[PDB]
Design an enzyme around this catalytic site. Structure first.
Site, PDB file in Angstrom:
ATOM      1  N   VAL A  47      41.635  14.294  37.132  1.00 44.94           N
ATOM      2  CA  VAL A  47      43.106  14.336  36.824  1.00 44.94           C
ATOM      3  C   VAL A  47      43.944  13.941  38.052  1.00 44.94           C
ATOM      4  O   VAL A  47      45.207  13.953  37.932  1.00 44.94           O
ATOM      5  CB  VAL A  47      43.547  15.732  36.324  1.00 44.94           C
ATOM      6  CG1 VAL A  47      42.842  16.135  35.042  1.00 44.94           C
ATOM      7  CG2 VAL A  47      43.388  16.825  37.382  1.00 44.94           C
ATOM      8  N   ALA A  50      47.076  14.662  45.042  1.00 47.09           N
ATOM      9  CA  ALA A  50      47.880  14.026  46.108  1.00 47.09           C
ATOM     10  C   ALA A  50      47.879  14.912  47.356  1.00 47.09           C
ATOM     11  O   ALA A  50      47.700  16.131  47.236  1.00 47.09           O
ATOM     12  CB  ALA A  50      49.275  13.786  45.595  1.00 47.09           C
ATOM     13  N   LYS A  79      49.642   6.636  49.281  1.00 39.51           N
ATOM     14  CA  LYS A  79      50.866   7.372  48.853  1.00 39.51           C
ATOM     15  C   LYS A  79      51.897   7.280  49.976  1.00 39.51           C
ATOM     16  O   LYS A  79      51.638   7.809  51.064  1.00 39.51           O
ATOM     17  CB  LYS A  79      50.532   8.836  48.570  1.00 39.51           C
ATOM     18  CG  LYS A  79      51.724   9.758  48.417  1.00 39.51           C
ATOM     19  CD  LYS A  79      51.369  11.217  48.223  1.00 39.51           C
ATOM     20  CE  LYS A  79      52.606  12.093  48.153  1.00 39.51           C
ATOM     21  NZ  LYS A  79      52.276  13.541  48.127  1.00 39.51           N
ATOM     22  N   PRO A 111      59.857   9.858  51.109  1.00 37.46           N
ATOM     23  CA  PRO A 111      58.828   9.255  51.946  1.00 37.46           C
ATOM     24  C   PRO A 111      58.571  10.067  53.227  1.00 37.46           C
ATOM     25  O   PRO A 111      59.263  11.020  53.453  1.00 37.46           O
ATOM     26  CB  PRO A 111      59.397   7.877  52.316  1.00 37.46           C
ATOM     27  CG  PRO A 111      60.815   7.851  51.746  1.00 37.46           C
ATOM     28  CD  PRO A 111      61.174   9.276  51.380  1.00 37.46           C
ATOM     29  N   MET A 198      27.412  34.263  40.968  1.00 36.41           N
ATOM     30  CA  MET A 198      27.490  35.588  41.627  1.00 36.41           C
ATOM     31  C   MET A 198      27.584  36.631  40.503  1.00 36.41           C
ATOM     32  O   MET A 198      28.215  36.313  39.479  1.00 36.41           O
ATOM     33  CB  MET A 198      28.717  35.591  42.543  1.00 36.41           C
ATOM     34  CG  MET A 198      28.794  36.754  43.495  1.00 36.41           C
ATOM     35  SD  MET A 198      29.717  38.104  42.755  1.00 36.41           S
ATOM     36  CE  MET A 198      31.391  37.457  42.726  1.00 36.41           C
ATOM     37  N   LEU A 349      43.124  28.462  45.968  1.00 39.28           N
ATOM     38  CA  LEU A 349      43.768  29.171  44.824  1.00 39.28           C
ATOM     39  C   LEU A 349      43.560  30.695  44.929  1.00 39.28           C
ATOM     40  O   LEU A 349      44.449  31.465  44.495  1.00 39.28           O
ATOM     41  CB  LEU A 349      43.216  28.565  43.532  1.00 39.28           C
ATOM     42  CG  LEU A 349      43.936  27.295  43.055  1.00 39.28           C
ATOM     43  CD1 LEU A 349      44.198  26.312  44.183  1.00 39.28           C
ATOM     44  CD2 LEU A 349      43.177  26.594  41.936  1.00 39.28           C
TER      45      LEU A 349
END
Ligand code: DTR
EC number: 1.14.19.59
Lengths: 525, 528
Positions: A47, A50, A79, A111, A198, A349
């Site tokens: 998916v 960046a 990019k 930018p 685990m 995360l």
């Protein structure tokens, strides 16, 4: 004696796991055993992800991995900005920019080029003076960055001989970067890859982790554990019981639906930028790579259902909402009360998340890994080391959260309940102060460098130029020019040469540079 | 046209004429500048010390070459502040006592940034070796070639004027003032009015419209700079802005000073300022060609002026009756706000600390720099004023804290002065940094190279006291981390890379201690 950490166990692979493994492999100079426990990889469509420009300096260069080598192995493209589309105009999502009240296109760039100065005042401030006084009709992005013209023509940030033209970051397949880094860690750094689930986390009497038990019954002993388990926080939240601080009182998006889209790179060329395409209940990324582009509609589920969102997302690209492959994520927005508790360090995360509106995910990982290496403990786990690490992660995160909130709070849009509720959110003090500073015509977080050193970027991440790109792009302007400019006619004139230099180099480079397409074709031997 | 048209600066000296000259260049002759100064009664040149940015940020901004202004104010070179006897008890003496461990009680606070290996400063590799017994070297001598150059009293430049090292300046304050007055009047059309102030005229909001002079002349203006010194004739008296006393952080509040003729033939010239510890405070020494400025800074709650004058005179063996003394009683602290309405305080009228780390000129330059950046129009936007005030308060408190650390972490407890230092509270800001240091972590890591740091004032202003300066003072006074930085236990290649950096410091030091002229011989050539 020897009180050192002997073994480190990293729970979870992907980017967070293999970045941590590879970085610690180099940082700890083979004085420490490193284990990655990763459940075998259920395959999901790439998916796209960046990044920001310090990724090569702060990470791949530390590891001695040349830029071209890793890009070739993960279908990477260039990019030069995030381009924001339709963030000012109401209605349904569309790849094509609507038209503003004043007739101009609803597109603006963020930018990474940093702004020249005259008389110690950034070009941002001279542009603002001329705009507020009617002396120019040019947008901030167009006046101030040659990069804007290069992106409009879809040209590459490098020449075919690989001379640098401009500053840039990277688009890539996350799972292929993970794969590349796994192989590097295992073959070059003696890291042990254990492919298993685990099942138990073993803890001593004082709440420290001693080992992970796997499904196969193997016991992975360690002195220090890195939680790269993702949103579940199997170690930091579950085992260690550290509360997660929800920050949906600062950002509303908490869901995404994503996929990958085949792309005619012959006809259209390749965009050397990420697009942030506004929608009714959030926004949709577009991350061009050679052959296709990743996309995902980020939304609040308090303002749209998964079906509403999937329909709206499918409508955007004109995809068959039943017979196209979708990935559906419900994410945590916020950070742990503390990133590191006892001998458990969260990274990725498991530590913290915001929506990828300004590509902050990979940056959060290498910043945390860099700070872990600098604060690396011995078995005494000195509370000051742990506290100073936690302080750096909370300041890093809150800084970027606030920058992102500014994108929502200052959108003029009021057409759906989502965009209206954005204006209902409280702003953190930190970002109110910076708005007040900008509105008086003063610079916010003036940059000090010519290099455009990770340490310089980490202490002042979102600079003056980035605040102007977002504020001015959404139509928020200072009340008046910087008063000092009224007393500095020589400086005004010096600034006029700088605007001329931007125009000239923009035009020269829009002519001499290869297309993103042609550079990618050459790169992927 | 809502612009400021006229700026009136109350007071001359360094604060007044630096403000006049800097605004002269900054405002590109779009504004009239007036300096009201009471005519100048001559005072003994007790000497002033500076920091290295002064030539780049100030004289070069004005287009004044270094050699030109130095020749006009009897200026010498400064590679550090050297602290003498700050760890050992007893009466003041120019000569260092010896520690229990056999080291002489001197440590240097030089300039420059420390090199790094594996993103860790050389400070931390030194600390590891010291805590582990692998070195008996002082932090200053391991980590700065400048320490060896200063030990030999050599110059920071060769006779052909090639730079060897970083440096700042010693000079006569009143002669720099004189030099800048002349420059401002003759090159920048500044109006010098030689008169006293009698009246401050205000509108209904309490904004200043004009100053009346003794001669009865009325100086109209849109913006007033208070450079009136400790009296704060505009900011405190007329505007009634309270001064925040900070003697709950620093105890010294008095000085007795003079200038001392010096045999530069016999002794050479020290290219550094000395901070010579005493019973009730400390004594500066600021070498210039032919003489050295000195002043005993003291608390008058712990010594009388007589006690202080005697002790000061004893130090150099001066005749306490037939030598000329200047006696200053100073306020220590800052205004609640530096800038109130259309009144901007600069210098002593804004804020003061004792000149223990040469912060006098720097406080003026920083305020002047920030005034030009925040320069208002007649609407006096409160955000411009507030952001200026924020910069001055943070600048001051940061340096107050740094200075308190010099006293609080002195091991000395032999006089009631040194004991009372340890009764004061530390500000939170400096407690946090001590705790960070004590765990082996860097404090205020520099994030740029030396070129950027000394080339862009904004880079220096956000990182003024770096990791290196905390190590110079903490390690110099004998405060050490509890343990080395734990990361170093896992990084044998990095240890080894640091050993090459120590070797580079030794080589440079030895090469230059042999090839450089004495400070004396460079000064002789400069003042030809
Ligand atoms: N910004 C620092 C200030 C500094 C470093 N060492 C000293 C010694 C004495 C006075 C000030 C300073 C620099 O100039 O490098």
């Amino acid at each position: 004696g020897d009180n050192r950490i002997k073994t480190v166990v990293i729970l979870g692979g992907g980017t967070a796991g293999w970045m941590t493994a590879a970085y610690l492999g180099k940082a700890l100079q083979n004085t420490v055993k490193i284990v990655v426990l990763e459940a075998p990889t259920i395959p999901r469509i790439g998916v796209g992800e960046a990044t920001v420009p310090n990724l090569q300096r702060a990470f791949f260069d530390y590891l001695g991995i040349p830029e071209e080598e890793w890009m070739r192995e993960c279908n990477a493209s260039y990019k030069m900005a995030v381009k924001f589309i339709n963030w000012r105009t109401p209605g349904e999502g569309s790849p094509d920019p609507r038209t503003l009240d004043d007739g101009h296109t609803d597109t603006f760039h963020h930018p990474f080029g940093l702004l020249p100065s005259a008389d110690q005042i950034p070009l941002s401030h001279y542009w603002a003076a001329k705009r507020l006084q009617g002396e120019t009709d040019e947008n901030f992005d167009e006046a101030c960055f040659a990069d804007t013209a290069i992106m409009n023509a879809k040209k590459a940030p490098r020449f075919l001989d690989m001379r640098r033209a401009t500053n840039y970051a990277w688009h890539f397949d996350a799972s292929k970067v993970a794969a590349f880094l796994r192989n590097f860690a295992v073959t070059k750094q003696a890291v042990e890859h254990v492919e298993d689930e685990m099942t138990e986390v073993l803890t001593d009497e004082r709440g420290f982790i001693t080992a992970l038990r796997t499904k196969s019954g193997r016991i992975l002993q360690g002195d220090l554990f890195v939680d790269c388990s993702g949103f579940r926080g199997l170690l930091i939240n579950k085992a260690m019981e550290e509360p997660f601080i929800d920050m949906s009182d600062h950002l509303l998006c908490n869901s995404a639906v994503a996929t990958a889209v085949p792309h005619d790179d012959e006809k259209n060329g390749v965009e050397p930028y990420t697009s942030s395409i506004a929608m009714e209940a959030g926004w949709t990324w577009k991350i061009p790579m050679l052959g296709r582009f990743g996309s995902g509609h980020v939304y609040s589920d308090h303002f749209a259902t998964q079906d509403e969102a999937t329909l709206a997302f499918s409508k955007l690209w004109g995809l068959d909402p039943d017979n196209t492959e979708f990935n559906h994520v419900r994410f945590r927005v916020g950070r742990n009360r503390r990133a590191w508790v006892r001998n458990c360090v969260s990274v990725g995360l498991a530590s913290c998340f915001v929506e990828p509106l300004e590509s902050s995910g990979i940056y959060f990982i290498y910043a945390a890994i860099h700070m872990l290496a600098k604060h690396f403990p011995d078995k005494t786990f000195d509370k000051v080391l742990v506290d100073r690490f936690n302080r750096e992660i909370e300041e890093m995160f809150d800084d970027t959260r606030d920058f992102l909130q500014a994108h929502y709070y200052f959108s003029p849009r009021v057409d759906t309940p989502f965009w209206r509720a954005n204006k209902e959110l409280k702003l953190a003090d930190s970002i109110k102060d910076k708005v007040e500073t900008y509105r008086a015509g003063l610079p916010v977080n003036l940059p000090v460098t010519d290099e455009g050193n990770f340490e310089a970027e980490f202490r002042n991440f979102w600079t003056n130029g980035s605040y102007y790109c977002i504020f001015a792009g959404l139509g928020l302007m200072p009340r008046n020019p910087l008063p000092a400019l009224a007393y500095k006619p020589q400086s005004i004139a010096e600034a006029e040469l700088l605007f001329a230099d931007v125009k000239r180099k923009g035009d020269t480079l829009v002519e001499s540079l290869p297309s993103t397409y042609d550079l990618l074709r050459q790169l992927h031997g």
